[PDB]
Amino acid sequence: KLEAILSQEVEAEIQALLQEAEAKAEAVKREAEEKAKALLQARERALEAQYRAALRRAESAG
């Protein structure tokens, strides 16, 4: 009989759901890694500019 088994047909639909949201808990983290990363690509280029600029000034001064 299905009684205890009756409950495993739900626990399988409500396991489908919980995996679909651990396929969103991965997507969210992808976007957030690609965000955190890009905030440091902007950090890299802007500093590089300010170091190109600081030595160029100090040459014209010299």
Binding site: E3, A4, L6, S7, V10, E11, I14, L17, L18
Partner: peptide, 9 residues
């Protein structure tokens, strides 16, 4: 048993 399945979700 249904109540446990839902709580466990």
């Amino acid at each position: 048993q249904l109540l446990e399945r839902l709580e466990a979700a």
